[PDB]
Amino acid sequence: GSSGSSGKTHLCDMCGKKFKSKGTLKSHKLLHTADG
Numbered sequence: 001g002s003s004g005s006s007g008k009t010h011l012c013d014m015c016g017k018k019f020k021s022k023g024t025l026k027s028h029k030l031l032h033t034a035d036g
């Protein structure tokens with residue numbers, strides 16, 4: 001809820017999407033930022 005979370009997730013601080021692994025969250029964060 002608005003006052004606090006429950007359970008556990010690998011949460012994106014950039015868009016607010018929630019993931020089931022740090023590997024899945026990392027594979028998602030490549031879409032926000034990458035080297036070039």
Ligand SMILES: [Zn+2]
Nearest residue numbers: 012014015017
């Ligand atoms: Zn994200």
